[PDB]
Every structure is written in C-alpha cells, then in structure tokens.
C-alpha cells in the first residue's frame, strides 16, 4: 500500500511521463519503501539484483542503483528525476544560507548526504509521515533533519529534557506542541532522541 | 534519532509496534569508504601537501579506496582511512556502529598542523639563507680591504 | 674587528650550513611527521603505553606501504612540545613522567573539542588551577545552583572545571558541541531556556576521578578523552624522590636546583641563538652581535660547569633502584 | 517609451570580486553602483565598464542593501546621496563627487542591535529621511542632516526583512510570512496581510500612473485622496502576490472590520525563491534563484517573456528606473546582480 | 580602443620591501601581483595600494619569473592560476581565491637541477600545461593536474634565458646569443636564428590579429598560424625576425632579421605588444613605445625608476577570453612599481 501511495503521489505531482520514466519512478519508490531498512551492503546488492530480475521478467532503462536514482521537487515545480551536480550546488548554497541563519556548523557535502536529505524530504512531505533514523553518532542525523525541516518550512521542537526531569516536564512539552499544532496551525517537526527517553 | 540500536531502551523503541508500524525506517548506519574518501579529499584540498617528490606506489586495488593514486593527497587519504579501520578493529568494537568522529577530528588537526609546520619551515630556511648571504658579503668586503 | 666577528660567527655559519643541508630531508619528512602527530593527538588519548606503541607500529606500516616518508627518530614530545611549555607545566606541578607530558600536550592543544580528564588521583585539578590561576572556577554536576554559576562563568569568561563527569547533565550540550549563533559582533549560546553571551576567554574542562564510570554516547564522541593513570616510571620516580628526601635532603635540593637552573640556561641559550639570527635578518650590528656572543659564551660556560654533579646522582640512582623495582 | 522590453542578450558584462548583493542606477548619468559580499562598493561607467570609476571598502562585512537619491533642493546645491547597510550593524552615507569621480563618506548611523537588512531614501519639501530595518525587529527613521534617530517602532514578532516608503506610510515584510502597513510619523499599525507560507523577501507599493493599467489606477475618490491602493510582495514561497490595502480611519486609525489585506492576484511560474521585483509601466519584472528573470503582464497576470540561465548562479537583485516620478526620466535600461560575481546590463 | 597610450605620469605608486622582479595583471579584476628578490609574493588592490590584499613568502630565494591564467573549463569551476619560479630550484603553482582574497598553494614542480629562469602557462580544450627553462639548459613541460613532467629536452649548448609557447611550438633564447624554434610534442628542432652579439633577455611570438607584422603574408603561413617573432638582448637592440616555414610531425632554416630597433642606452629587459605599438623597458630607466609600422620611437618615459626597469605587463589583445583593458604596470629595481590606468 505504501508503494502504491508513493507511486500515485509522484505521478500526481510530476511532468508528462514516459514508460522509462514510469519504470524508474516505480524502482525509486521500491527502493525507498523496501531497502532503506537494510543494514548490510551484501543485502543491498542482492536487492538491486532482485529489482533488475523483476524488471526483466515482468516489465521488459538505465542504471537503477540507489545513488543513480535522484527524484526530487527541490529544483523545479514538479517531482522529477534531477541531475546530481545541480542538486549538489543547490544544496551547497542553501546550506550556506542555513548556517548563516540558524546554526553555523561546518558541514561537508557528499553524495550520501544528498540521498539522505532527499529521502527525509519525501518523508516530511507526506501526511502522517514520521521518521526513525538509525546510525552512528556524528553522522549528521539531527543537523540534516533540521536542515530539511527548515527547507519545508516546518517549526522544529527539540525537547529540552535534562537531568532531574520527570513525566510532568515531558508531558508539558508534548501538550504545548500539540496545542500549537492544533490551535495555531504551526506545522511542527518534533525531534525525539533516544537520550530523551 | 537512534545512535545505538542494541541499547536496552533503543531496542525497545525499534521493537515497539506502535512506532514501528507508523514510522519510516532509514538505516543510515555508519560511513563507507567512499563517503570517507570524499570528505577527506574535500578537507585536504586546501593544505600545502604536494611540495616534495613522490613516487607512486604499487598496491592492490582493494587496498585503494580513492581513485588510482597519482599524488600525495590520495596517499594521505588512503592512509587515514586504513588507520581508522585498523584502530576500530583492534579496539574490538565488534558490530557496534563506528562514529566517524575520530576520522573527522584527525583530519581537522592534520590541516591545522600542516599549515603552521610548513610556514615555519620555509620562514626558518629563508632566515638561514639571508644570514649566509650576509656572511658571504662581509667576507667579500673584508677580502676587498 | 671584522675578522674577529667572522671568526666568532664561524660557529653560526657551521650550524646554518648544516640546516641548509638538512632542509631537503626535513621537507620530505614534514607530512609524515604531521600525520603521525595528528593521529597521536586524536586517537591515543585514551590508551595505555603498550596500545600506543602497537598503534604506532601499525601506522608506520601504513606510512611505509603508501610511500610517505617520515622521521625514523620520531618522538611526540620532541615534535609538539617546546621548552617554555615544559617549564610552565612542571612549575604548575605536573608529574615528571613522559606519559604525563604527552597527555598534557594532548589536553592543552585541543582548541575545538572539550578535554575530558579521567584523573583518579585528582592531581590535574590542582595542576590546571595552578596553570590558570585566578580564572579557574570549580563546579560539579552534583551541586545546586550549577546552571546559574555556569551561566555567570560563561558570561564573565572564567575557566571552568566541572567535576563528577560520570553524571553528565545534557543541559550543556550546546557548549559541548559548540553550536553557537553569531549576532553581529556577539556570540550567543542557549543554556537551559535563555541565551547568554560567550566571552571568548572561557574554556571548559570536565574532570572525573572514576574509571569504569559511564559516559553517554552523545558526550563520548564529542570530547577529547584523556587518561591520567599511574605507570611504572611514575612509581619509580616517586619512590626514589621520597627515599632521597628522607635519606639526604642536601643532595635532593642540590639536584633539583641544578636541574631547574640547567633548564633555564638551555632556554636562554635557544633564545640567544634565535635573537642573533633575527638581528642579522633585520638589517650597531658589530656591537650587538658581540654582546650576544659574549652572553652566549658565558651561559655555555655556566652550563658546562653545572654538569660536574650528574655522575654522583647517577650513582645514587643506581644505588636505590631495587626499592623502586620491588 | 514605456513598452520597451529588454532584448535576448545583455549589452554589457561586469566582473566583480564577490557575489553581488545589491545594484543601483544613477538617475541622471549612465553609471552603475554595485555592492558585494566583501562590503566593497564599485561604480562602473556604462560605456567603458572594464575598469571601475572608483571603489571603496567602508564596511567590514557583507553589504546587504543600498539605495540612492538625487537631492532636489528648492533654495544649497544638488548632488547624489548613496546609502549602504551591511552586517556590520551600521549604515554608511556617501556622497558621489561627480567631477572627480570619487566617493565621499558623510557619516555613519548607529543604534541597531543586529544585522541591518534594508534601507530607503526619500525627500520631502526640503527634508531627507532614511528608513532601515534589522534583525532586532525594529524599523528606525533617521535624519540625513542632523544624523540622529527620529522614530523607532517594532511592528513584527519575527525580524523585518524588507520595507518601502510612500509618503507617511511604511509597509514591511518580515521573516514571519505576514505583511504590515503602519503610519510612519505616529508609529501606529494600521493593517496586516497574510497568505504566504515562507518569509517575505521584497515588498513595495504600486504607485499610481496616468494613462490603462490594471493596478495603477484608483478605484474610489477616497483612494484618489489617499494616493495608493495596491502593494506587491515576493517571498521564498516561489510566488508573487498583489494585495489591495484596506482604507483606514483618517493620524489614521485601524478600522477593526477593515484591518486585513486582500490578495487580488497570485503569480506563479518561478522554480525557486523570488528575490526582487520591479515595476515599469504595465510590466512586473522579477528575479529568482532559478537563474532567470521573468516579465509579467500586469493586466492579464501572465508571463510574457523569460530569460533562462541569465546567470550561472542565483540572481540576487534587479534594478529598473523609477517611472512614476517626474524628476527621474525612465531610461531604457536594467541591471541584474547574481551570485556568479557578475552583473549584466541591458541597454536600448 | 587598441590605440590607447599611457599618460606621462603613473596613476598609482606601489612600494614593497625589495627589488621587483616580476609583475603580472589580473585578467578580470583591478589587481596587480608583485614578486621580489626576497621570495615574497604580493597582491595589491589597484584602488587601495597602501596595504597588500594578501602577502606570502613563497620561496626562500629570489623569484625569477611568474605567469597567470584564468582557467576556462567546458564542464568544475574556473579560477585564476599563478605560477612562479625562483632560485630555490622549485616552481610553485598557486591559486587566487578571490572569495577570501588570499592565495592557495596547489602543488610544486620539481626536477630542475639549477636556477630556473622563465615559466609559461596555456590551456588546451580541457588541459592545462606549464613550461620552464633553467641554467641547466633543459626545457621541461609539466601537466598542471597530475603534476609530473611530460617532456624534456636540451635546445641550447648554453643555458636558456627566455621562452614562449604558441600551440605546439616553443622558441627559446639562451645566454648564447642564438634563438631557436622547436616542435614541442616531439621535441624536434625546426630552425635557428643568429645576429645578436649579447645574451638574449626576452623572446616571444607575434600573434595574428585583425598592422605591419600581425597579418600573415602568404596562405601557407595562414595555415601554419604564425610568421614573425621578436627578441631583445643586452645588445641594446630589438629585432623582428621571420620563421622559415618547416617541412610539414614537422621536419627542419634561419631567422631573417627583417627589422631592428635601436635607441636604448643599456640592456633591453622586457617587451610587450599591444595592438599597433610595441613597449620595451630597459636598464636605462626608460620605457619606449615603438610604432610597428614605421619602426620608430614614439614616446619615452624617462627616469621612471631610479634604478633599472625590470618588467612590463599588458593585457593580451589576441585572445577571445582576455578583454584588453587600458592599463600597464612597470616593475623596477628601486622597490617600486608604477601603474598606468586609462
Ligand atoms: N559531512 C560532514 N562533514 C563534517 N562534519 C560532519 C559531517 N557529518 C557529520 N559531521 C559531524 O557531526 C556533527 C554534527 O552531526 P549531528 O547531527 O550533530 O550528529 P548526530 O545527529 O549523529 O548525533 C559535527 O561534529 C560534525 O562535524
């Protein structure tokens, strides 16, 4: 069902499609729905081979690796496959502005960063869409989440949970965020960390 | 945001069906050698390294994580990546995620150190050359008289 | 006068020719030395001596494999520690061990990260307090009013040492991760629920005298962790010092005074050798050069005189080693 | 006359040392003033543009905006005044010495507590004022001659990003997505306008002109007596909106039933944030991060001509010549400044 | 346009620590680069010339030459590339980061065994190359990206003192008074030229522009792409030569001295061609403007520097990517540099 909804959302906000465009879009949605939870590189390669075999068997196209598919609406008026270097330059300038405006952090932009912020973007563009980011510390999780939320015009709420805090303070923070979201229509991105539980 | 998947509390979050059914799981994991190489190449492209002779080594392809080695910078990046892997192997981290924090911090320290060291080296050499020229000129003047 | 000046400067000419010859080798080994020192600084802070040696072996294997020349006689203290730093640290009360010198150099050369001090003997609190004098402010995560005192210290610009590091309070995560906001010519950080100004004269040290404590994964990956654990050399040195102090304090005082005076003399000699070259480079001369030369010979003569006691102390050391070993 | 449309290629290309943050046109002579992220300030003759006429580094950080004015003294000698605001938390006033072709600083204005982001200059009978907004959420009014402040009001919750001045009224956009019109001398808010989903980048009045033009002609005799009806805004929302201002109770007073704007038209077609807007006759020009300049028809609300890939990077600012004023003759030229450290000039 | 002539006084006066040995001009911005005997490199803003934009001790001995280039990639971001050679036996390749107004050392070129004299830069479709000559009588060619040499040859029994590059052909002037043209990629001598009685100081091609010598004579020369060249030596004489067409992998034969300019009181140091005229500095503290058509001196800037006048720079007028601005800079032995604008 998630794959179906993703395909519909991409088509409804996309340009005139062709068969190759449709197949690449379907492959990108399959990647995001299925293979983002995979841990090992071996499993990812097996999934790529599975995609190739499925396309050959049922739907007889370029290279459909994870980094070879870059669909985004950040560079145009509609969801479409974008070029890598244009996205890199756009993200670099946007991040310069973001550092100058919110928090100065010397971040170096690489390809996996671009991919991760693209998928965080597609997740925050949905309705009732939430994230669970899993990775080593100091891999840019919170920074990228804040950057993408800033791009989409969300309001960031990091709970100020510290030592000597209890259920009342967390409840107050949650109630405040909920009340803002409802009575003030403040679209909010709540960042809950494992150290806050 | 989850740093340690195997914690007592974080595994409870990942297991919790209320969260697991609504959330979208994005297993960022840790950095691969390609991301490491890109970051290192970007950081060490502003420091004076290629100021000396360099004979390109002959090493196995799987030991090379960058493009084929042509200059000192590629050697430095490969060395840093290799040492990071070896250090995390010896310290017996196991399967626990490896933060790239040591790698990044080492890169920044290397830049900040190479700059000053190179500047000091050339300034001292210039001072020595000027002193030698002064002594030779004085000797020539003495021989004149 | 000219001939005498040339004859006096013949030694400087010899040194300068030697330096000119060594320039190529120094430039060839520069990058390898810098790589080794940086890795030593960012990885070896939380390893004992054996692990440091093994990792140096691995790193030197890697450097040799990729054709990056380095100093075969490399030594961290020689490369990254100056005489002034050694004198200041020793006067502040640091132990005389080489391991403590390396760890202090690691701690004092971290302008970006916050040094975390695992010091079970609580010696480094006193050492740092002596180093920074009046600026030092002592706090701990286990007290009340901690947040307000920290805000006052940040605003004013004190040097802060927070004890009980195993009880980290995440209310200072912005200070830990250096997530500031620049407001024109002002720098603001959000501690608690309100922004404060960062003076720029403000440093942070986290101290904990509890090995096998607990460091949250947020804090561990953002601090420079340094261990101050006693080793064989420190125990032997302390035992010998106590034995000599309780046996014959005259030799003890004489040895200490000679050591300190010799260190001062070598520092002054280095300063003179630098100043002579600067005087030549900034061009009267025939007078200042001779004055500096005479001062250099006087200091060298005093240093040569001061070396007539060291054999006695070596004999004394050989006479007392069994106590240290046992 | 006024239906001049620029051609497909610029007639000049100016190279500078940093990103161009603001550009301006001399209202009398063929001269262009250019600002950069280094805080420099250039001046290029429009026929020999390979060397600047003069340069000046007065600020220590990036210049954010600038504006010019040719003084019209009715009984003194006229000259050109240039005002630049930067992230130095300061505003510097310059005088352009034409015969020697040099800049001449006059004074600096202090008092803002954070990044100043806009300035404006206008002249009354024989008075000159300066308006400025900054991140401290304060809009200040200054006296050109005395040099000290005359008013200071805070009309927004977020920080004000842009302003415009028409007589005694100042309309301001902010980092919050809301517009607001206040009466300057009394410092009282009059009406607000919402509808944008991203911070406001530009905002300015649509001055009345004699001719027919859709939004440049009054609707009631009350508007004729009040002198203005419509305003235009640009935001990071990739949209340009035309608003119609409600009439206040003339010192004015906010009518509670009529204290909100009314977006009468929304222009879409840009691919990214819209950075600047300018109005000439029946056309509205705009530049955006998509490396392009649009030209909209005010009557039908359509995009008549597109200038794709004019710059290799973001297009920071435009500048056309004011046409609604009699003292400024609307010459046929416009200038664009971009992130690629280049400025294009269209002539004739 | 191309007929601009400098005024009788310099618009700017720049003071440095030591004798100025080489001066270059930023192709796009009003910035001048200065190198001295102390190995220090300077970048001066042409409107605030009391403090350098940046400064840098690049070498440990005197700098002997330098050259600049604005890269033009058809795919990457373009930037200015600065290359300097000194008596350190090393060549340093810098990069001008206009965003921060500072230098950026990229790499260094090594292999010459004794003091280097001159350097050159040029760009192919997407390839950037460097050239050099030294007292060890070797001419080396380098790849700007990889950094290692691509060609080496010895075109003179004595040591080369000046070179210039045009396509695939390089002409070198030695301490021995003979010039010589060689074919770069294959390293084949094509012809020589004699007639000077003192060591050469400079040599450069004359490029075809749309003038007496800048226009091809025959169709075969048009196909070849060059006909003439100029050189100046301690003979106090500037000579315009003619390159005999080779046996076109070219195969080899004498340079015909079809003109000679005299009048300088000392050694002619540097030359530069701007459209019709020709500019030349010399040790007699003078700068001369020579009409290429008549071959006669037009204007003289006497007593420009107290000491020798070392080098001149003018914007290239024959390149589609270098707009020929109206300015020139003169570097002198007296720790001063003169700038003429408009
Ligand atoms: N691409 C990168 N370049 C530089 N530093 C990076 C990069 N990615 C992560 N970091 C480092 O990670 C930290 C910021 O990431 P952050 O989101 O705060 O970490 P996490 O969310 O994993 O706890 C900084 O220390 C920063 O230097």
DSSP assignment of D267-336 equals EE--SS-EEEEEEETTEEEEEETTTEEEEEETTTTEEEEEEETSSSS-EEEEE----S-SSS---SEEEE
Angle between helices C285-306 and C2-43 (to 10 degrees): 60
- Residue A107: CB within 6 Å of ligand 1? yes
Q: Are B24 and A130 in contact (CB under 8 A)?
A: yes
Q: How was this structure determined?
A: cryo-EM
Residue for token digits 């790849």?
Answer: E143
Strand arrangement of the beta sheet that strand E40-45 belongs to: E20-25, E31-36, E40-45, E54-57
For D47-73, give the DSSP string: SS-SS-SEEEE--SS-EEEEEEEE---
List helix spans (H) across chain E: 219-224
Cβ within 8 Å, pair C58-B86: yes
For residue C72, with 0-12 CB atoms within 10 Å meaning exposed, 13-18 middle and 19 or more buried, which class applies? exposed
Span from the CA of C136 to the centroid of ligand 1 (angstroms): 31
Q: Are E136 and E153 in contact (CB under 8 A)?
A: no
Task: Supply C252's token pair.
Answer: 């003890």
Q: Are C124 and C117 in contact (CB under 8 A)?
A: yes
Angle between helices B33-43 and B72-90 (to 10 degrees): 130
The span from the CA of C204 to the CA of C175, in Å, is 9
Angle between helices C285-306 and C249-281 (to 10 degrees): 160
Smallest CA separation from ligand 1 atom 26, residue = A138
Give the distance from residue C308's alpha carbon to the nearest chain B alpha carbon, in angstroms. 34
Q: Are C276 and C16 in contact (CB under 8 A)?
A: no
Contact with chain E for residue D52, Cβ under 8 A? yes
Residues 6+ apart with CB under 8 A from A102: A146, A150, C181
3-state secondary structure at position C141: coil
Give the distance from residue B105's alpha carbon to the nearest chain E alpha carbon, in angstroms. 23
The span from the CA of E177 to the CA of E237, in Å, is 12
Q: Report the relative pairing of strands E188-193 and E160-166 from DSSP bridges.
A: unpaired
Q: How many CB atoms lie within 10 A of CB B92?
A: 7
Beta bridge partners of D130: D121, D142
- Residue B69: CB within 6 Å of ligand 1? no
The span from the CA of A17 to the CA of C60, in Å, is 57
Residue for token digits 């061609």?
Answer: E273
Nearest to E264 by CA among E228, E312, E292, E232: E232
Give the distance from residue D134's alpha carbon to the nearest chain C alpha carbon, in angstroms. 11
Residue C167 has what DSSP assignment?
G
The span from the CA of A115 to the CA of C262, in Å, is 62
3-state secondary structure at position D221: helix
Cβ within 8 Å, pair C66-B139: no
Secondary element (H or E) of residue E280: strand E277-282
Secondary element (H or E) of residue A10: helix A2-12
Span from the CA of C220 to the centroid of ligand 1 (angstroms): 14
Q: Are E60 and E88 in contact (CB under 8 A)?
A: yes
Cβ within 8 Å, pair C221-B57: no
In Å, how far are C202, E29, E281, E313 from E32, measured between CA atoms?
A: 42, 9, 18, 10
Q: How many CB atoms lie within 10 A of CB E303?
A: 9
Smallest CA separation from ligand 1 atom 12, residue = A138
Residues 6+ apart with CB under 8 A from C310: none
The span from the CA of D64 to the CA of B59, in Å, is 53
Pocket test for ligand 1, best of C114, C177, C223 (most atoms within 8 A of CB): C177
The span from the CA of E262 to the CA of E280, in Å, is 11
List helix spans (H) across C93-145: 98-108, 123-132
* Closest residue to A153, CB basis, from D197, D269, D339: D197
The span from the CA of D7 to the CA of D313, in Å, is 21
Give the distance from residue B10's alpha carbon to the nearest chain A alpha carbon, in angstroms. 6
Return the residue in C144, C198, C218 with the most chain A beta carbons within 10 A, the one to mutate for interface testing.
Answer: C218
The span from the CA of B107 to the CA of B119, in Å, is 19
- Residue A140: CB within 6 Å of ligand 1? yes
In Å, how far are A80, A147, C204 from C200, measured between CA atoms?
A: 48, 28, 11
Chain D neighbors (3+ CB pairs < 8 Å): A, C, E
| E45: Cα within 13 Å, side-chain hemisphere | 19
* Closest residue to B52, CB basis, from C16, C27, C42: C27
Q: Report the relative pairing of strands C159-163 and C203-208 from DSSP bridges.
A: parallel
Span from the CA of C179 to the centroid of ligand 1 (angstroms): 11
Give the total residue count for chain C: 326
Contact with chain B for residue E211, Cβ under 8 A? no
Secondary element (H or E) of residue E23: strand E20-25
Residue D258 has what DSSP assignment?
G
Q: How many CB atoms lie within 10 A of CB A60?
A: 6
CA C285, C288, C292: angle at the middle one, nearest 5?
130
Residue for token digits 């007290």?
Answer: C143
Q: How many CB atoms lie within 10 A of CB A112?
A: 18
Secondary element (H or E) of residue E201: strand E200-205
The span from the CA of E296 to the CA of A18, in Å, is 72
The span from the CA of A195 to the CA of D200, in Å, is 37
Task: Supply C316's token pair.
Answer: 């004394």
Task: Supply B24's token pair.
Answer: 């979208």
């Amino acid at each position: 069902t998630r794959l179906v909804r993703g395909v519909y959302t991409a088509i409804n906000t996309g340009p005139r499609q062709t068969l190759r465009s449709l197949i690449r879009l379907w492959a990108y949605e399959a990647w995001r729905i299925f293979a983002d939870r995979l841990v090992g590189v071996k499993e990812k390669n097996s999934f790529e081979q599975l995609l190739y075999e499925t396309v050959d068997k049922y739907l007889p196209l370029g290279n459909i690796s994870s980094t070879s598919l870059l669909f985004s609406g950040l560079l145009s008026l509609d969801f479409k496959e974008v070029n890598k270097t244009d996205l890199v330059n756009f993200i670099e300038e946007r991040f310069k502005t973001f550092c100058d405006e919110e928090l100065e952090v010397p971040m170096v932009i690489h390809e996996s960063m671009v991919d991760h912020i693209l998928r965080i973007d597609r997740a925050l563009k949905q309705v009732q869409g939430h994230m669970m980011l899993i990775g080593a510390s100091r891999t840019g999780k919170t920074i990228l989440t804040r950057f993408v939320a800033w791009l989409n015009g969300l309001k960031i709420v990091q709970p100020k949970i510290h030592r000597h805090s209890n259920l009342s303070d967390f409840d107050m923070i949650l109630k405040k965020a909920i009340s803002d979201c409802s009575l003030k229509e403040s679209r909010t991105c709540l960042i809950i960390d494992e150290s806050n539980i | 945001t989850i740093c340690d998947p195997t914690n007592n509390k974080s595994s409870a979050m990942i297991s919790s069906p209320a969260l697991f059914n609504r959330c979208i799981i994005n297993w960022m994991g840790d950095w691969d050698t390609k991301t490491m190489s890109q970051v290192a190449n970007n950081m060490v492209d502003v420091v004076p390294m290629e100021f000396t002779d360099f004979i390109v080594p002959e090493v196995n392809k799987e030991l090379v994580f960058t493009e084929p080695i042509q200059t000192i910078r590629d050697a430095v990046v490969n060395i840093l990546i290799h040492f990071d892997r070896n250090f995390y192997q010896k310290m017996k981290v196991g399967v626990n995620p490896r933060s790239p924090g040591y790698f990044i911090d080492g890169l920044r320290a290397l830049v900040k150190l190479v700059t000053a060291k190179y500047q000091d080296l050339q300034e001292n050499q210039r001072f020595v050359n000027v002193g030698l020229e002064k002594l030779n000129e004085s000797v020539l003047k003495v021989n004149e008289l | 006068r000219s001939i005498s000046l040339v004859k006096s400067l013949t030694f400087e000419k010899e040194r300068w020719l030697n330096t000119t010859k060594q320039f190529s080798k120094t430039s060839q080994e520069l990058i390898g030395n810098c790589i080794i020192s940086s890795i030593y600084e960012t990885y070896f802070g939380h390893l004992n001596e054996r692990e440091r040696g093994d990792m140096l072996v691995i790193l030197k294997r890697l450097l040799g494999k990729f054709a990056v020349k380095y100093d075969v006689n490399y030594r961290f203290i020689d490369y990254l520690v100056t005489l002034d730093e050694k004198m200041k640290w020793l006067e502040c009360g640091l132990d005389k061990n080489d391991y403590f010198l390396e760890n202090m150099s690691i701690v004092m050369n971290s302008q970006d990260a916050v040094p975390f001090l695992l010091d079970p003997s609580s010696h480094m609190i006193t050492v740092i307090s002596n180093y920074y004098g009046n600026k030092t402010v002592l706090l701990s995560f286990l007290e009340e009013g901690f947040v307000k005192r920290l805000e006052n210290a940040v605003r004013f610009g004190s040097v802060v040492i927070i004890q009980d590091g195993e009880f980290f309070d995440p209310i200072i995560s912005r200070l830990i991760s250096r997530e500031f906001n620049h407001a024109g010519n002002r720098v603001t950080v959000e501690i608690g629920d309100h922004e404060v100004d960062v003076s720029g004269d403000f440093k942070l040290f986290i101290h904990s005298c509890d090995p096998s404590g607990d460091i949250p994964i947020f804090l561990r990956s953002r601090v420079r962790l340094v261990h101050f654990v006693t080793n064989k050399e420190s125990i032997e040195t302390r035992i010998f010092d106590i034995t000599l102090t309780e046996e014959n304090a005259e030799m003890q005082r004489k040895r200490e005074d000679l050591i300190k005076l010799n260190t001062e003399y070598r520092l002054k000699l280095k300063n003179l050798e630098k100043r002579l070259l600067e005087e030549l480079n900034n061009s009267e001369l025939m007078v200042t050069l001779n004055n500096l030369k005479k001062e250099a010979m006087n200091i060298e003569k005093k240093l040569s005189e001061s070396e007539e006691f060291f054999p006695q102390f070596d004999n004394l050391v050989e006479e007392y080693s069994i106590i240290g070993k046992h | 006359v006024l239906k001049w449309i620029p051609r497909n290629l610029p007639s000049c290309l100016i190279n500078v040392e940093s990103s161009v943050t603001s550009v301006k046109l001399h209202p009398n002579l063929p001269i262009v003033f250019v600002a950069t992220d280094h805080g420099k300030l250039y001046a290029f003759d429009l026929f020999n543009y390979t060397i600047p006429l003069a340069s000046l580094q007065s600020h220590t950080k990036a210049i954010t905006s600038m504006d010019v004015l040719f003084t019209n003294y009715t009984n003194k000698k006229n000259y050109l005044v240039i005002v630049t605001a930067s992230k130095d938390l300061q505003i510097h006033v310059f005088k352009w010495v034409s015969e020697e072709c040099k800049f001449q600083q006059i004074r600096s204005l202090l008092g803002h507590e954070h990044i100043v982001s806009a300035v404006k200059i206008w002249q009354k009978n024989n008075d000159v004022h300066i308006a400025s907004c900054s991140r401290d959420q304060t809009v200040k009014i200054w006296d050109f001659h005395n040099g000290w402040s005359l008013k200071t009001f805070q009309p927004h919750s977020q920080w004000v990003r842009s302003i415009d001045v028409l007589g005694d009224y100042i309309i301001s956009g902010s980092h919050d997505t809301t517009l607001r019109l206040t009466h300057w001398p009394s410092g009282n808010g009059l009406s607000v306008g919402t509808g944008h989903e991203f911070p406001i980048e530009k905002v300015k009045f649509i001055h009345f002109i004699e001719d027919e033009i859709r939004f440049r002609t009054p609707s009631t005799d009350r508007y004729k007596n009040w002198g203005m009806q419509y305003c235009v805004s640009a935001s990071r929302d990739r949209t340009i909106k035309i608003w119609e201002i409600p009439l206040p109770t003339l010192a004015p007073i906010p009518n509670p039933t009529d204290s909100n704007f009314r977006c009468v038209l929304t222009l879409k077609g840009h691919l990214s944030w819209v950075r600047d807007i300018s109005i000439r006759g029946q056309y509205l020009f705009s530049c955006a991060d998509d490396k392009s300049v649009r030209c909209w028809d005010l009557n039908t609300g359509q995009c008549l001509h597109v200038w794709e890939k004019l710059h290799t990077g973001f297009v920071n600012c435009l500048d056309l010549d004011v046409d609604f004023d009699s003292n400024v003759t609307p010459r046929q030229m416009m200038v664009t400044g971009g992130l690629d450290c280049k400025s294009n000039v269209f002539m004739r």
